[PDB]
Amino acid sequence: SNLMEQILSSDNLNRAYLQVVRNKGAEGVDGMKYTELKEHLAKNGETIKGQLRTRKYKPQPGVPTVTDRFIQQAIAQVLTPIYEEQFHDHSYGFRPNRCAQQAILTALNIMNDGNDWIVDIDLEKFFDTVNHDKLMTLIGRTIKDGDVISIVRKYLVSGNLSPLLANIMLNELDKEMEKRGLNFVRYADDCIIMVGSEMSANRVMRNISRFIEEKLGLKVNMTKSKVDRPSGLKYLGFGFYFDPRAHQFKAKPHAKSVAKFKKRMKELTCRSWGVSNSYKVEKLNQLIRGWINYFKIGSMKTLCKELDSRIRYRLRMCIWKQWKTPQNQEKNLVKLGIDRNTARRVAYTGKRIAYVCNKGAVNVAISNKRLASFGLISMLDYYIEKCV
RNA sequence: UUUCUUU
RNA sequence: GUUUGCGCGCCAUGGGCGCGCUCUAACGGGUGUAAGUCCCGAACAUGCCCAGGUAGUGGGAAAUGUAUAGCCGAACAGCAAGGGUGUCUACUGUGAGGUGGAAUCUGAAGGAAGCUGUAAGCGAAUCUCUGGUCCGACGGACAGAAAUCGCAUAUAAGGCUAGGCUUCGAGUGAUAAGCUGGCAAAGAACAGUGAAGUCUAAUAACUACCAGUAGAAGCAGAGUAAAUGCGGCGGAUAUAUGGAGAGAAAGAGCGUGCACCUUAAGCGUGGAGGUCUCACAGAGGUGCCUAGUAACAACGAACUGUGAGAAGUCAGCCGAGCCCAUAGUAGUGAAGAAGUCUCUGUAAUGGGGAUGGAGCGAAGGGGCGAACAAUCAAUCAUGUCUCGUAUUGCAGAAAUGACAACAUCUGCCGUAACCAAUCGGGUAAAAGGUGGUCAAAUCAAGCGAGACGGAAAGGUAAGUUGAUUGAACCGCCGUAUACGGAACCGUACGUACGGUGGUGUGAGAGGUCGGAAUUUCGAAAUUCUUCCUACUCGAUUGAAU
Ligand SMILES: [Ca+2]
Ligand SMILES: [Ca+2]
Ligand SMILES: [Ca+2]
Ligand SMILES: [Ca+2]
Ligand SMILES: [Ca+2]
Ligand SMILES: [Ca+2]
Ligand SMILES: [Ca+2]
Ligand SMILES: [Ca+2]
Ligand SMILES: [Ca+2]
Ligand SMILES: [Ca+2]
Ligand SMILES: [Ca+2]
Ligand SMILES: [Ca+2]
Ligand SMILES: [Ca+2]
Ligand SMILES: [N+]
Ligand SMILES: [N+]
């Protein structure tokens, strides 16, 4: 019919195929490729369109098969309209042109607006817990084409459609929390509410947990769902703090996120990797660019100084270990600039790698400037350029 | 900072 | 690829068992039949202490040295026969090449059984007790294996480095195997600590000069890993292991023997296979040429025999056995070979004994290849779907009802003179506004869920036989045999033989020009890739590409 032809338009299906090419995904439960998807749509696209129009297509069984990924992408690219008009302004997750940094900025705006007390709410394992009939009556309450309802229900009995389904079922919660008058910031199944006082935050936690367990039919993980103050608040990788200058709360990378970055950096700058130090520096540059590009709305200037010093120190160990022989270490320390009468003495401390790379002649030869010329982007100046 | 040797 | 790494023979300057001769505790003394042993005497300089913070004089407790016969000779020097070099050369050859010199590297951890001088170290039967270390394979520690047990261990257990906090709190110290020094492993140096016992616990301070604490227990972290750590049992312990206690106890040097044993860079000798050169006849190309491009392959005429020559081998990884040639030759064997019989041993390789009367028997490089390990191929009712009938899970609208009582969000109270636990309470804390709430007879959208039914149709391999791949490496253990450096870690897994796990295909170039495509007719060009090559690099303890 009309909306189902809007699903199965030629430009829409070509856009879905190009988008699933850009995703570069893997095989499903049977085993095929995206170029195999291309020859599949070349030979068998009309049968797929006929089965979708005639309500006979059956899904396949985590990762979906790539023809189901393509069909789900088509359904997502038609259904991100009117739903996206209907969604809330504070639903900052799995939507076009919205990202996590906007969620953290909105949370900081509401936190500085006077609402300190946080109702963190943890919805446990959403996509299996939800009742299918309620979700399909929501979908039928916005759209009235039976065939798209049929294929989405067959998919829920069995992707890029599941984030949109999560946004529908939690858009019900957002409409309720706009009806009550609550301020909130909600990434996809990560919702935090902002209350003025702590017992009112307990009451809001109790009432919203009652509403979620009764009306949405979801399960609230009461072990992790807690009432806080914006200091023990982990949200989207960001922790929050209060400046002594009594004007603003501010975001920062939480200690779990800093620990994840430090673990990844220690894996990239491991001393015994057989790759060249240019490869370690390039992987470090990719990780540093990604970490700062996610977190740059926080304040980590001291943290970026410390992490830059630690990255440089581990790179001094990698370069000193790759030299691997005291004659070669003495030759390279003379070549980099350290005088031979001292370079031989440091090089015949060939072991004690952390001790010699901590300070001294190896600090002077492999300086900050030599590593900066080597291609190691500093965390501090990259954060300075990429901040406000 | 071992003005050393080897796997 | 690699300094060398092969076979056979010889030789001890190594070792064993005996004999002799001469020594043995600074220098001396005693005990005693006998002292090398048991015991007692003197200084001297060091170490440590008299601190109070070091540097000098006066002193004091342990310990060491001069100072046992002697051994050993550094990761210490010097000499150094020999060995290598796309290096420069003088001669010599028709040439492959061979010499003799210079330069430089090397002279090695496995036989010039290299030489000389040292620092440092060591230096006495046997027994008992004890500390430390090491071993009882390897394998992130499983499996497999002939292989000590149990637990823990990659977020990184564990160690270590630099701090922090909280409680203690200076004062005995020597002797020193070992441990640790921010981690792949081991050794050496230096530094700090330091188990076990044992010995000490004594002295007395000035002349210049410089201004609780030191230190450990405990706790949370931070940083740092090519992974082992802890405990039990058993064993080793001549780096003459740190000691302690008995011990009238042996230790060392030299010479000499043995029908004694053994050795990888010493001496003599042997090098096939392949590679290369030259000459003589053929085969060709133009009387003269035969190769080149690392080999393979290909261009071209550059191919063959035969004979004389030259350099030269010698690296476990899936290989029992066989073939080519040096070669049944050197060598070995009458001091007893092969065969035969009989005691025995190992996980496997073995070792005696008795007959016997002549055998056994190499080197390097290719080829075939049983077997092993993977991989591959060949052989050998439900459930639809189509009509139903009774239901059903979830929306929504509203005739009527009942009770006004529920849902919801801004959450403080007295104080003090003004305190958010900053004062006492309390977290559905009081005062509050906002929407009234619930049941819906019935009708009803859409996707499903399933029941009762009539109805379309439906329901071998194991084994064995082949073929391909297993290129290169990492080790480890038993016996024999040598070294650095006893142990550990190494010497190509040290090497030879015998066991045993693990990783699985570096780059360029050349070829195969197979495989894939784009262009033209699977054939030509191009790009990536499979297969072959120690030519050129890349390593070297692995691993990595
Ligand atoms: Ca080696
Ligand atoms: Ca001496
Ligand atoms: Ca061992
Ligand atoms: Ca091990
Ligand atoms: Ca640790
Ligand atoms: Ca001693
Ligand atoms: Ca030698
Ligand atoms: Ca010759
Ligand atoms: Ca092999
Ligand atoms: Ca190697
Ligand atoms: Ca070893
Ligand atoms: Ca090796
Ligand atoms: Ca060698
Ligand atoms: N070699
Ligand atoms: N090896």
From TrEMBL:
Protein name per its UniProtKB record: Group II intron reverse transcriptase/maturase
Encoding gene per record: ltrA_2
EC number: 2.7.7.49
Keywords: Nucleotidyltransferase, RNA-directed DNA polymerase, Transferase
Reverse transcriptase domain sequence ranges: 48-240
Cross-referenced Pfam families: GIIM, RVT_1
Top-level taxon in the UniProt lineage: Bacteria
Species of origin: Agathobacter rectalis
Recorded GO MF terms: RNA-directed DNA polymerase activity
Catalytic EC class: transferase
Lineage, broadest ranks: Bacteria, Bacillati, Bacillota, Clostridia, Lachnospirales
